[PDB]
């Protein structure tokens, strides 16, 4: 199976540089060109340039020739893109993508969000949104995780290490008054089986190297003091 796996999102200070990576597996790295592509959210994609991994030769979009530097590491099957002297216009998702012959782009990395900012990275806190068989709608229960107070974007959430995907809604982040982001991820499940099924949210915030797993259980008190 062909895969391209990119490095994690990062915050970068204005004027600093950043180096992005793209590891190729499942094919002969030197047999395909590697492209890099920029996308500001919801915009047409823009081609940055190309490297030939067999010899290091590069070609650039004139618009990016002063911004990007492309290299490879053979033994690591990895392509690198260094972006210089970052400014706000550089905040975007960056993709690597392979091309057999400089026509179509047939396999893509997952993208790396680069946020240009003077603010410090912060990892989130994770809180349960607990279900109850006493709080149902149509016999279904809802549960989730609240992922609060992080910077920059993004957070990703999986459930049960990716085994639970049906009925999952991971909301777009909101920007809080603090300048930190928050999101929730929720799931609806049978109300009959909250005592037998296990629901764990797996939260990742790559800018801060945060991974949190949180087991979400129905809450256990008749005593109010």
């Amino acid at each position: 199976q062909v895969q391209l796996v990119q490095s994690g999102a990062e915050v970068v200070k204005p004027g600093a540089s950043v180096k992005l990576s793209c590891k190729a597996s499942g094919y002969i790295f030197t047999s395909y060109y590697m492209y890099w592509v920029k996308q500001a959210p919801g915009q047409g994609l823009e081609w940055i340039g190309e490297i030939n991994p067999s010899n290091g030769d590069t070609n650039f979009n004139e618009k990016f020739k002063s911004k990007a530097t492309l290299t490879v590491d053979k033994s690591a099957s990895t392509a690198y893109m260094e972006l210089s002297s970052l400014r706000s216009e550089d905040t975007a998702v960056y993709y690597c993508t392979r091309s057999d012959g400089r026509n179509d782009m047939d396999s893509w990395g997952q993208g790396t969000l680069v946020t240009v900012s003077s603010a410090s990275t912060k990892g989130p806190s994770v809180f349960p949104l607990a279900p109850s068989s006493k709080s149902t709608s149509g016999g279904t229960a809802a549960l989730g995780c609240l992922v609060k107070d992080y910077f920059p974007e993004p957070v990703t959430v999986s459930w049960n290490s990716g085994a639970l995907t049906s009925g999952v809604h991971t909301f777009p982040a909101v920007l809080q008054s603090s300048g930190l982001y928050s999101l929730s991820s929720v799931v609806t499940v049978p109300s009959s089986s909250l005592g037998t099924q296990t629901y764990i949210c797996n939260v990742n915030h790559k800018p801060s190297n945060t991974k949190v797993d949180k087991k979400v259980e129905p809450k256990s008190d008749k005593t109010h003091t």
Partner: protein
């Protein structure tokens, strides 16, 4: 450089209807034998995925309902019968002359049947209350269309601030939206009141739905 202009910007289609989207190149992108236009599908949060190469060749693994046509400057992508999973932004890209460029995308929206939300309310976690803040969450699940009003009431009083909402994109399996509304208070503020409620209005409901709890 060659400019690709896609139309429409957003295409709205009922479940199972045909969708046709257009890409026009600012100059010819075909030889006398082949057309150098390619189509991609970008699902929410994902990279683009190649669907059609050289105007009309379906990429291996791509569903048979996708087809492409055209030559010269004017190209089309057709989905014969739209499925929920086809919710995406679609992009064209040429490889005629350098540099390759992309169109601005067409968003495909799906006009599924009306569905009322299912509503859930969540008190703050004990763990969060230990840190001095209380987030109360109201979930509106699996509704259509998007328009919805959520109001917070604390001891029956309409709250004028301190909440934030987020809505999902259309769901990949059923084309509905979901919405979260989070009321955030200091622990001390939280503890000065008794009843927390969210009141939801949506066209699939004939009266507002209220979910509540007592702290």
């Amino acid at each position: 450089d060659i400019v690709l202009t896609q139309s429409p910007a957003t295409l709205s289609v009922s479940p199972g209807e045909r969708a046709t989207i257009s890409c026009r190149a600012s100059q010819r992108v075909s030889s006398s034998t082949y057309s150098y236009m390619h189509w991609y599908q970008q699902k929410p949060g994902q990279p683009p995925k190649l669907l059609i190469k050289y105007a009309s060749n379906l990429e291996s693994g791509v569903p048979a309902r996708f087809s492409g046509s055209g030559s010269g400057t004017d190209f089309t992508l057709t989905i014969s019968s739209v499925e929920p999973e086809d919710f995406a932004t679609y992009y064209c890209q040429h490889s005629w002359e350098x540099p390759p460029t992309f169109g601005g995308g067409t968003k495909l929206e799906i006009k599924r049947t009306v569905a009322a939300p299912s509503v859930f309310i969540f008190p703050p976690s004990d763990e969060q209350l230990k840190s001095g803040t209380a987030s109360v969450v109201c979930l509106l699940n699996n509704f259509y269309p998007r328009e919805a009003k959520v109001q917070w009431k604390v001891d029956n009083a309409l709250q004028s601030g301190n909440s934030q909402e987020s809505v999902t994109e259309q769901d990949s399996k059923d084309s509905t939206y979901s919405l979260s509304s989070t009321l955030t208070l200091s622990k001390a503020d939280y503890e000065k009141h008794k009843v927390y409620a969210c009141e939801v209005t949506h066209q699939g409901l004939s009266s507002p739905v209220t979910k509540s709890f007592n702290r």
